[PDB]
């Protein structure tokens, strides 16, 4: 509900913004205009701490002493089945850290959220997306009112920037995993009070490689060559974990290509490679062909002949996914199966290989069974099982799971009884902009621009998505006047 | 150096909607554009917007019963509704007027098109500038940054479609 995006275009005498944003927000988070544009990705900025309290004598232990809770008696109303409401009491207990919650297992936890004193989130975004210059953009960003997100920026003057943005507490010790778990709630040692300014955070501007990127990876290869390393920052800002195969593809697609056109940029975004197959099939196939089971041999020959792309017509891709579920977990992020582990020294070519081929063939054996049960056969076309269905529009799917290496993402659901599955998460608003004069931009919204019952604008873009047939985005008045189908005059009197 | 194309200067307030239901909102000043934007959003996503604003008031349990209760406890315990009132008062006067206009656009869409608002979210109306601030606050700080799941020791993401 909360995550649904909406596309819009605003024009006044003093500003212009085009793009997508979460419904209910009065500013456009994914915005561009004739001068500039930004986008966002989740960085998981650790902006809160959960403290384990030690309860003692009706208070909590803190620096050797029992300390009483701040307590207030509040209440809220709860609607009953018969349409009335009843008054329910609610105690709000609080420690120095913040408000206290009790987990089902009895753990008393106090949550401390940073940046509760930052009222200007909406205005900061607003000033960012209507900035007259990069310096103005940066001064807005530097206010620290937007508590999270990677944020990427480009403009018609030629500047690009990546910022690992958010409001991060200053701490004197502890790495990210420590501050992500339950931190001890019995000592002022772990009670932070200040937060980092913008120039303490990983950022990159106009780097020698001529691009920036982020695909939810930790911020240590935002560009290539890199301009910093993890030791340049406090160890609690971001993980030092293996980069996903999608994120590896992100770096490669940008770094290895040059003399880019908007057209080629768009084509690169559609990348749907089974990178994990590149890392595993060289060891897996010969090991599997040794197996006496003729079904495993046949499975191995089907995988070997596959071009390793998640296309609609792929007969091997479903089977490969089912193998990967076992070899790398249900999220495809597990590392224990590989022979050569991930390394930041080879960040787009590790991990690699199959550590234990014999065990992996056993995983293939099980995956064959799983595949036939889910989909009816080991060689069902990928796009016959994977469909994009909104109202009465039913179109073939392509691309897939990010952790298998697909850049363009469709997190396919578990299949229904007929083996049909649809995206639960993935491509929504997709736009590509060139900051020429005038700007040129194309985009699509997977699930349309409206969700009101009976609208003709819920399912009217998904067929175009199935063919990567992008809409030209219309910012110039004359383009808008040529395309208009409805005019709503309004007037606002405060 | 080459300047950008001449900016368009709106002379009247209007939404030009294209064939995919994208609103092109022209305002003679900022508050007008924000009003148009709220009207549009109400038209395209009104019901779920009203539900979300209702929740961010801490009134989910009151409006819609037990399925909304744990979110209500999370938000009231974290003081979200009152903090939003403070952030709203703490806005710069000019941006506050933009937020007020946005909310007024929602209210106006609903008032002019009451058939399009689902019965059980009607009780949310009217919405205010502070509701707009509150929803943003709950989204950023109390879904993205601090989720109920990570504090309460639960797990799987939201589940209401």
């Amino acid at each position: 509900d909360y995550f649904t995006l909406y596309e819009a275009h605003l024009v006044t005498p003093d500003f212009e913004i085009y793009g997508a944003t979460q419904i209910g927000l009065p500013v456009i988070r994914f915005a561009f205009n004739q001068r500039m544009g930004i986008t966002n990705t989740v960085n998981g900025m650790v902006g809160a701490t959960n403290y384990r309290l030690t309860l003692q004598d009706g208070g909590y232990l803190y620096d050797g002493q029992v300390r009483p809770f701040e307590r207030r008696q509040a209440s809220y109303r709860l609607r009953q089945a018969d349409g009335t409401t009843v008054d329910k009491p609610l105690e709000i207990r609080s420690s120095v850290h913040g408000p206290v919650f009790e987990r089902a297992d009895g753990t008393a936890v106090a949550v401390r959220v940073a940046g509760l004193d930052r009222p200007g989130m909406l205005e900061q975004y607003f000033d960012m997306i209507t900035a007259d210059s990069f310096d103005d953009y940066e001064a807005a960003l530097a206010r620290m009112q937007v508590p999270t997100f990677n944020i990427v920026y480009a403009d018609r003057e030629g500047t690009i920037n990546y910022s690992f943005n958010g409001v991060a507490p200053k701490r004197a010790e502890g790495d990210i995993a420590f501050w992500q778990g339950l931190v001890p709630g019995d000592s002022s040692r772990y009670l932070w009070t200040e937060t980092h300014p913008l120039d303490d955070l990983p950022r990159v501007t106009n780097p020698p490689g001529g691009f920036v990127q982020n695909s939810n990876d930790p911020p240590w290869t935002p560009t290539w060559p890199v301009t910093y390393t993890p030791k340049d920052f406090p160890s609690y800002l971001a993980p030092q974990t293996p980069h996903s195969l999608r994120a590896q593809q992100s770096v490669r697609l940008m770094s290895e290509n040059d003399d880019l056109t908007l057209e080629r940029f768009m084509a690169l975004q559609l990348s749907h490679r089974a990178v994990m197959a590149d890392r595993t099939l060289p060891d897996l196939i010969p090991a599997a062909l040794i197996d006496p089971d003729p079904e495993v041999q046949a499975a191995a020959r089907l995988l070997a002949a596959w071009d390793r792309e998640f296309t609609s017509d792929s007969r091997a891709a479903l089977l490969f996914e089912e193998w990967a579920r076992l070899f790398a977990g249900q999220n495809f992020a597990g590392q224990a199966g590989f022979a050569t582990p991930w390394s930041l020294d080879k960040p787009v070519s590790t991990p690699y290989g199959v550590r234990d081929p014999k065990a992996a063939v056993d995983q293939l054996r099980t995956a064959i069974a799983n595949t036939k049960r889910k989909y009816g056969a080991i060689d069902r076309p990928f796009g016959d099982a994977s469909r994009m269905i909104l109202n009465d529009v039913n179109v073939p799917g392509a691309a897939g799971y990010g952790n298998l290496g697909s850049f363009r993402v469709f997190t396919w659901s578990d299949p229904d009884e007929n083996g049909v599955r649809t995206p639960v998460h993935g491509e929504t608003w997709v736009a590509m902009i060139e900051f020429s004069t005038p700007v040129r931009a194309y985009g699509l919204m997977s699930y349309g621009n409206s969700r009101q019952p009976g609208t003709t604008h819920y399912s009217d873009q998904i067929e175009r998505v199935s063919r990567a047939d992008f809409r030209e985005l219309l910012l110039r008045r004359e383009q808008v006047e040529a395309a208009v189908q409805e005019r709503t005059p309004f007037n606002f009197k405060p | 150096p080459q300047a950008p194309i001449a900016a368009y200067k709106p002379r009247s307030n209007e939404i030009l909607w294209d064939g995919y239901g994208v609103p092109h909102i022209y305002g003679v000043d900022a508050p007008s554009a924000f009003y148009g934007y709220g009207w549009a959003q109400a038209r395209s996503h009104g019901d779920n917007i009203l539900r979300l604003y209702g929740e961010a008031r801490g009134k989910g349990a009151e409006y819609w019963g037990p399925d909304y209760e744990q979110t209500t406890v999370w938000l009231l315990t974290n003081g979200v509704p009152e903090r939003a009132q403070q952030w709203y008062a703490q806005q710069s006067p000019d941006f506050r007027a933009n937020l007020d206009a946005f909310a007024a656009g929602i209210n106006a869409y609903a008032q002019q098109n009451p058939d399009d608002i689902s019965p059980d979210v009607r009780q949310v109306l009217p919405v205010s500038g502070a509701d707009v601030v509150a929803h943003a606050h709950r989204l950023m700080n109390f879904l993205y940054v601090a989720s109920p799941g990570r504090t309460l020791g639960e797990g799987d993401p939201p589940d209401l479609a």
């Binding site: 995550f3 001529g210 695909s215 992100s250 975004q269 590509m432 900051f435 020429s436 | -």
Partner: peptide, 28 residues
């Protein structure tokens, strides 16, 4: 989600490029 920005020197026409590409729930 994915995000790309490309500097002028890496393009043919000499203008920066931007990809907006948030991955979010469809909630069908």
């Amino acid at each position: 989600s994915n995000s790309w920005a490309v500097a002028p020197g890496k393009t043919a026409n000499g203008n920066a490029l931007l990809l907006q590409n948030p991955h979010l729930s469809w909630t069908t």
